[PDB]
Design a protein around this motif. Structure first.
Motif, PDB file in Angstrom:
ATOM      1  N   UNK A 184       1.231  -1.312  -0.294  1.00  0.00           N
ATOM      2  CA  UNK A 184      -0.117   0.183   0.381  1.00  0.00           C
ATOM      3  C   UNK A 184       1.152   1.599  -0.063  1.00  0.00           C
ATOM      4  N   UNK A 198      -4.481  -5.061   8.970  1.00  0.00           N
ATOM      5  CA  UNK A 198      -4.896  -6.561   8.459  1.00  0.00           C
ATOM      6  C   UNK A 198      -4.562  -7.317   8.079  1.00  0.00           C
ATOM      7  N   UNK A 237      -3.422 -10.890   9.761  1.00  0.00           N
ATOM      8  CA  UNK A 237      -4.073 -12.162   9.204  1.00  0.00           C
ATOM      9  C   UNK A 237      -2.622 -12.998   8.744  1.00  0.00           C
ATOM     10  N   UNK A 240     -11.838  -6.910  15.690  1.00  0.00           N
ATOM     11  CA  UNK A 240     -12.455  -7.950  14.005  1.00  0.00           C
ATOM     12  C   UNK A 240     -12.050  -8.973  14.875  1.00  0.00           C
ATOM     13  N   UNK A 258     -12.451 -11.493  13.407  1.00  0.00           N
ATOM     14  CA  UNK A 258     -11.862 -12.862  12.274  1.00  0.00           C
ATOM     15  C   UNK A 258     -10.284 -13.070  13.831  1.00  0.00           C
ATOM     16  N   UNK A 259     -10.489 -11.950  14.344  1.00  0.00           N
ATOM     17  CA  UNK A 259      -8.164 -12.057  14.727  1.00  0.00           C
ATOM     18  C   UNK A 259      -8.880 -13.446  16.269  1.00  0.00           C
ATOM     19  N   UNK A 312     -17.030 -23.247   6.466  1.00  0.00           N
ATOM     20  CA  UNK A 312     -15.047 -23.105   6.449  1.00  0.00           C
ATOM     21  C   UNK A 312     -14.738 -23.697   7.146  1.00  0.00           C
ATOM     22  N   UNK A 341      -9.166 -21.657   5.089  1.00  0.00           N
ATOM     23  CA  UNK A 341      -9.993 -20.273   4.114  1.00  0.00           C
ATOM     24  C   UNK A 341     -11.309 -21.150   2.760  1.00  0.00           C
ATOM     25  N   UNK A 342     -11.357 -22.420   3.061  1.00  0.00           N
ATOM     26  CA  UNK A 342     -12.156 -23.531   2.657  1.00  0.00           C
ATOM     27  C   UNK A 342     -13.314 -23.376   2.543  1.00  0.00           C
ATOM     28  N   UNK A 343     -14.834 -23.812   1.954  1.00  0.00           N
ATOM     29  CA  UNK A 343     -15.951 -23.571   2.221  1.00  0.00           C
ATOM     30  C   UNK A 343     -16.520 -24.126   1.963  1.00  0.00           C
ATOM     31  N   UNK A 387      -8.341 -21.928  -2.626  1.00  0.00           N
ATOM     32  CA  UNK A 387      -9.443 -22.728  -1.111  1.00  0.00           C
ATOM     33  C   UNK A 387     -10.578 -23.191  -2.179  1.00  0.00           C
ATOM     34  N   UNK A 388     -11.287 -23.833  -1.865  1.00  0.00           N
ATOM     35  CA  UNK A 388     -12.515 -24.632  -1.884  1.00  0.00           C
ATOM     36  C   UNK A 388     -13.183 -23.065  -2.139  1.00  0.00           C
ATOM     37  N   UNK A 406     -20.061 -11.981  -5.158  1.00  0.00           N
ATOM     38  CA  UNK A 406     -18.754 -12.849  -5.114  1.00  0.00           C
ATOM     39  C   UNK A 406     -18.599 -13.545  -6.234  1.00  0.00           C
ATOM     40  N   UNK A 440     -14.060  -8.697   1.955  1.00  0.00           N
ATOM     41  CA  UNK A 440     -14.586  -9.391   3.395  1.00  0.00           C
ATOM     42  C   UNK A 440     -13.863 -10.117   3.372  1.00  0.00           C
ATOM     43  N   UNK A 441     -13.052 -10.010   4.949  1.00  0.00           N
ATOM     44  CA  UNK A 441     -11.782 -11.415   4.841  1.00  0.00           C
ATOM     45  C   UNK A 441     -12.387 -12.647   4.834  1.00  0.00           C
ATOM     46  N   UNK A 442     -13.748 -12.919   4.735  1.00  0.00           N
ATOM     47  CA  UNK A 442     -14.226 -14.659   4.668  1.00  0.00           C
ATOM     48  C   UNK A 442     -14.412 -15.092   3.582  1.00  0.00           C
ATOM     49  N   UNK A 443     -13.833 -14.164   2.040  1.00  0.00           N
ATOM     50  CA  UNK A 443     -14.003 -13.985   1.013  1.00  0.00           C
ATOM     51  C   UNK A 443     -12.072 -13.813   0.413  1.00  0.00           C
ATOM     52  N   UNK A 444     -11.024 -15.478   1.227  1.00  0.00           N
ATOM     53  CA  UNK A 444     -10.166 -15.773   0.530  1.00  0.00           C
ATOM     54  C   UNK A 444      -9.940 -15.644  -0.718  1.00  0.00           C
ATOM     55  N   UNK A 466     -10.112 -12.833  -2.411  1.00  0.00           N
ATOM     56  CA  UNK A 466      -8.884 -11.803  -2.400  1.00  0.00           C
ATOM     57  C   UNK A 466      -7.968 -12.943  -3.485  1.00  0.00           C
ATOM     58  N   UNK A 467      -7.497 -13.614  -3.654  1.00  0.00           N
ATOM     59  CA  UNK A 467      -5.845 -14.749  -3.842  1.00  0.00           C
ATOM     60  C   UNK A 467      -6.760 -14.683  -6.076  1.00  0.00           C
ATOM     61  N   UNK A 493      -6.083 -10.366  -7.422  1.00  0.00           N
ATOM     62  CA  UNK A 493      -4.522 -10.288  -6.996  1.00  0.00           C
ATOM     63  C   UNK A 493      -4.020 -10.740  -8.194  1.00  0.00           C
ATOM     64  N   UNK A 502      -7.318  -4.342  -0.588  1.00  0.00           N
ATOM     65  CA  UNK A 502      -7.421  -4.524   1.217  1.00  0.00           C
ATOM     66  C   UNK A 502      -8.247  -5.904   1.333  1.00  0.00           C
ATOM     67  N   UNK A 503      -8.752  -6.715   2.349  1.00  0.00           N
ATOM     68  CA  UNK A 503      -9.306  -7.080   3.295  1.00  0.00           C
ATOM     69  C   UNK A 503      -9.676  -7.073   4.136  1.00  0.00           C
ATOM     70  N   UNK A 504     -11.039  -6.997   4.254  1.00  0.00           N
ATOM     71  CA  UNK A 504     -11.462  -7.282   5.671  1.00  0.00           C
ATOM     72  C   UNK A 504     -11.098  -8.031   6.423  1.00  0.00           C
ATOM     73  N   UNK A 505     -11.326  -8.299   8.175  1.00  0.00           N
ATOM     74  CA  UNK A 505     -11.913  -8.990   9.313  1.00  0.00           C
ATOM     75  C   UNK A 505     -12.761  -8.884   9.841  1.00  0.00           C
TER      76      UNK A 505
END
Ligand SMILES: NC(=O)C1=CN([C@@H]2O[C@H](COP(=O)(O)OP(=O)(O)OC[C@H]3O[C@@H](n4cnc5c(N)ncnc54)[C@H](O)[C@@H]3O)[C@@H](O)[C@H]2O)C=CC1
Ligand SMILES: Cc1cc2nc3c(=O)[nH]c(=O)nc-3n(C[C@H](O)[C@H](O)[C@H](O)COP(=O)(O)O)c2cc1C
Ligand code: SF4
Ligand code: FES
Ligand code: NA
Ligand code: NA
Lengths: 155, 418
Positions: A18, A26, A30, A65, A67-68, A133, A136-138, B4-5, B103, B134-138, B141-142, B145, B173-176
């Motif tokens: 950035x 964040x 992560x 946050x 998730x942490x 999840x 990272x897998x859902x 990721x799946x 998504x 959002x963090x829960x969409x990894x 994100x990838x 990028x 940027x990613x949420x958390x």
């Protein structure tokens, strides 16, 4: 406390990504949680230094946050959606299957530190409810037999 | 590479625009996107003036697909009347219950969004754009990028894009885990490396946003329309659906339907048609009791003939359709909505902080049959008093859906009061 060079290198990459170092906060947290399986409290002072932020700023961000996790080390986080659509379509069936397989309930870690069940709000996959999840897998939960197969892939 | 799946969400389109590739549940990379004439709208846009692009987006009737339906062209016009530098933000925080429309664009056709971001950034004179996912969409994100690196390699990003003199970098940027970080001013606070605390508005981001500079925040789905407006022209775009609410719209349909998934339809489509014509009707052919428009509105079975547009009598919101049938307990459903707002209030405003907590705490007692007479009256009062002094939309609507269930399903609530 010191970051291992492999982790430190990843953190510096985020901080350099950035235009302003503090924007990486964040992505860094992560990265730290990915490495350690939680946020070690001791990690926050060095991270604050690297971001050129006060420690109290970094601490407030970790607290904010959801998730942490500063409390429990877990290799795999099983995030189970407890929101309206997953609740309608069988969140409770998924939790029951998870208890039968792993012997733990939401908020608990297996005795080997392998799995933590984390109750989460809507994961944005509601057509595929009930959703979970594994890191990272859902996945859509279909049945205990199907869930058992999925979990066997995480060692 | 390997991502990721992701669940394979069903996607269906009558328009073949936003879902032309995203109807297939896999990543479409830049070569596939270019084969379909991808990035030719960007080439066309860079041969137009920024002001011309704003005029086309204005005349298209494109409205904010994030849920509020603010006219997009007019938002850009407000930004550009203010001195630069300016920033462009793609809102990919999508965390409304039932909402999974954004998504499938991100994860399946990332270049549609990227092309949209580049054209939009050029239009408002932003040389720096962000995606806040959002963090829960990894996986998203990838995928973004990787897609941004593809766009760089093909010369659609970086300095002097296709010899235009226009410079752009897109930062992901990613949420958390905070729903409130989807609120555009909380989003900006998070991008600045802070807690997601919404700001008093006005000012709107278009006057004072990221680092206090003019900032446009637009939703993923809004931005994904921009390439079509340039490619077709605003006139041809306006032929799609009704002329006052034109263009494709994504409808994420979930709960008790046979074909839950994302539907690309024009906004003259009725709620009844979404459920019965497209989503295959109800599970077990049971009667519709209610539709939750995410966590925002509750429509009864008497309100199914409304258009899925941004009109006063229309469905509006995100286009999110959560279907409950005759056997679903409306009070149990109300409790899940209360629990959501309890979990997500940022706590800056007192009536929102205490009201979201008490609404969920008291409604749980009601649901479990442990509520005193005072708990019942307390619940009614707090539900009506979350909004006062609120500085963002969360406080404003945390009581809204639940109040609609009290008005539309009184017989069911009365069962619990006994
Ligand atoms: N997609 C999702 O997952 C979620 C969507 N939402 C949606 O959020 C919506 C509420 O969003 P808000 O930003 O509070 O709505 P809003 O109506 O206050 O503003 C909408 C947009 O128009 C702009 N705007 C409004 N008035 C303006 C003015 N006078 N000058 C310049 N720009 C102006 C705002 O800056 C914003 O970008 C709800 O309707 C809900 O559907 C909420 C949560 C999650
Ligand atoms: C609590 C809250 C959460 C929000 N979450 C989102 C979100 O996840 N995505 C989104 O695009 N807009 C979200 N919004 C709306 C944004 O503030 C904003 O209106 C929108 O991103 C503007 O883009 P649009 O005009 O293209 O719809 C949220 C609003 C509130 C009040
Ligand atoms: S209304 Fe609620 S969520 Fe919005 S800023 Fe105030 S306390 Fe935070
Ligand atoms: S309610 Fe569970 S994924 Fe949306
Ligand atoms: Na491919
Ligand atoms: Na997807």
């Amino acid at each position: 406390f010191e970051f291992p060079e492999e982790l430190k290198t990843k953190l510096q990459e985020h901080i350099n990504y950035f235009p302003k170092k503090r924007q990486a906060i964040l992505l860094c947290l992560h990265e730290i949680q990915n490495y350690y399986g939680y946020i070690p409290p001791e990690s926050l002072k060095p991270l604050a230094d690297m971001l050129e932020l006060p420690l109290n700023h970094v601490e407030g961000v970790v607290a904010f946050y959801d998730m942490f996790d500063r409390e429990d080390k877990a290799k795999y986080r099983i995030r189970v959606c407890v929101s309206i659509v997953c609740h309608l379509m069988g969140t409770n069936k998924l939790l029951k299957a998870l208890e039968n397989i792993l012997g733990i309930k939401p908020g608990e870690v297996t005795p080997d530190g392998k799995f933590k069940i984390v109750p989460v709000q809507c994961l944005g996959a509601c057509s595929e409810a009930p959703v979970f999840m594994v890191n990272d897998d859902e996945y859509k939960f279909e049945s205990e037999v199907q869930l058992n197969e999925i979990l066997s892939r995480y060692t | 590479r390997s991502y990721p799946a992701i669940p394979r969400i069903y996607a269906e389109t009558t328009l073949n625009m936003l879902l032309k590739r995203a109807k297939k549940p896999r990543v479409h990379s830049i070569d596939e996107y270019l084969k379909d004439g991808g990035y030719q709208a960007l080439e066309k846009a860079l041969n137009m003036s920024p002001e011309e692009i704003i005029d086309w987006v204005d005349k298209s009737t494109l409205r904010g697909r994030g849920g509020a339906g603010f006219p997009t062209g007019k938002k850009w016009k407000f930004a550009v009347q203010n001195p630069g530098p300016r920033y462009f933000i793609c809102n990919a925080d999508e965390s409304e219950p039932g909402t999974f429309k954004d998504r499938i664009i991100i994860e399946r056709d990332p270049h549609l969004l990227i092309e949209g971001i580049i054209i939009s950034s050029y239009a408002i004179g932003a040389n720096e754009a962000y995606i806040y996912i959002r963090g829960e969409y990894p996986a998203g994100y990838y995928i973004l990028r990787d897609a941004i690196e593809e766009a760089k390699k093909k010369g659609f990003l970086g300095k002097n894009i296709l010899g235009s003199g226009f410079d752009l970098e897109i930062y992901v940027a990613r949420g958390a885990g905070a729903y409130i970080c989807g609120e555009e001013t909380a989003l900006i606070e998070s991008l600045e490396g802070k807690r997601g605390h919404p700001r008093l508005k006005p000012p709107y981001p278009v006057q004072k946003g990221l680092w206090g500079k003019p900032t446009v925040v637009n939703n993923v789905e809004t931005i994904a329309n921009v390439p079509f407006i340039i490619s077709m022209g605003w006139e041809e775009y306006r032929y799609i659906g009704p002329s006052d609410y034109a263009g494709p719209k994504l409808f994420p349909v979930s709960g008790k339907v046979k074909k839950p998934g994302v539907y690309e339809l024009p906004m003259n489509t009725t709620l009844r048609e979404v459920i019965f014509k497209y989503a295959g009707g109800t599970l077990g052919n049971k009667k519709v009791k209610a539709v939750f428009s995410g966590a925002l509105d509750c429509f009864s079975s008497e309100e199914l003939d409304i258009p899925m547009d941004y009109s006063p009598l229309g469905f509006g919101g995100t286009g999110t359709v959560i279907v409950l049938t005759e056997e679903d307990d409306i009070v149990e459903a109300a409790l899940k909505i209360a629990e959501f707002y309890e979990h997500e209030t940022c706590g800056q405003c007192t009536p929102c902080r205490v009201g979201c907590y008490e609404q969920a705490n008291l409604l749980e007692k009601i649901y479990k049959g442990e509520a005193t007479e005072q708990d019942w009256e307390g619940f009614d009062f707090v539900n009506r008093n979350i909004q006062p002094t609120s500085i963002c939309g969360l406080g404003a609507v945390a009581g809204r859906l639940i109040r609609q269930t009290l008005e539309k399903f009184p017989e069911e609530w009365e069962k619990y009061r006994k």
